[model samples]
Target: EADLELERAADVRWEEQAEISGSSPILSITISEDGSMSIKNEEEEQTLGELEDGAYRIKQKGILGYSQIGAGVYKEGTFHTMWHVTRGAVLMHKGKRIEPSWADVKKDLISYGGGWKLEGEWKEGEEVQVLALEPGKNPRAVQTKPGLFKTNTGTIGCVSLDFSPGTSGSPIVDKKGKVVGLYGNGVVTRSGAYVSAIANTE
Candidate 1:
């Protein structure tokens, strides 16, 4: 059926045709076959960490089109490493460029100063959706990975986006448009990761 077709789909040509969900910024993280990483959005795009001379060089700087940003930090494998999107960065949402007042993630809460807000009341097995990009492709869509939410205290110890669902940095939002978690890594699932958020300041 159509489900099988979507499962094998390689390229999603149009954003509208996809099962769009949530109003968060649609961002793409592209990984070239050569081991380079490229973050792309509707407004700004950046690429880095390419393989060169048998080693990958990661420059110390803010990533993902954000001007004043923070370096990537891992939480000892319990959660995935995240790159902070600070002030002065413009995020792309539904073809519009959004400049968040300030963005930060800590202890299961994410704040980006836009419609993006901090919510912590989601229950386990509740239906939730994730709005994110499709791999290296520019078009973004919304999909239910694992579909049902799985957490009690707002921290998702694990999750899924299965089969080109999304890369790291994708926002997992509840039905009320409240961001509950963020996809930390891989297309299949976040393995064991968690995040939270706060509503925009302005």
Candidate 2:
């Protein structure tokens, strides 16, 4: 009795933020919002235009990979990103407004079956938690549903799976390996759910 239809379109609600280095191989980026994106390299500030939902690739610009980023509800000039980075890169929102690390992000991608290297412990019936460093966003833990397993967003009913810091974009898989959700947010214990962002991979 699973809502397979709802599971298929889960990614439509999922979002992501990647950080490129100032001097890295960045061809170009297409902004999805109407805000200007600025890059600072060697004391030089260059502003970018807003882009709609589309594909963006590197052309011949300095790319350093995203530092602090997120994907969620964007409203009123502010993005309610689910995951936020904290150190070792550009700080969005504010210098102190940290997001998740690239390593952690990679982990999430793999957890959700994005085909990346994976580490840490993945077990059945365990409670997995998605953690972030966003100021107001606290850590969240997700419990697995019965007969389900954790891949990216933990389990569906039972048999939960836990992801570590480097497992941001991982996917949650069911017993048949059907994707359920992507891994992101952290959980608030009192809320009775883990704070993890999930994109339907099915």
Q: Write the per-residue lDDT of candidate 1 for residues 3-102, one digit (tens) a residue.
A: 0000111111113323354322332232222111224322122332111101111122243421212111111111111334222333332233334333
Residue 43 Cα positional deviation in candidate 1, in Å, after optimal superposition:
11
Candidate 2: TM-score? 0.23
| CA-only RMSD, every prediction | 14.6, 16.5
Each model's TM-score, in the order given?
A: 0.35, 0.23
lDDT of 1: 0.31
Give the poorly placed runs of model 2, Cα more than 4 Å off.
1-166, 191-202
Tens digits of lDDT, candidate 2, 97-128: 32323234432221111222222233445333
Alpha-carbon error at 38 in model 1, in Å?
A: 19
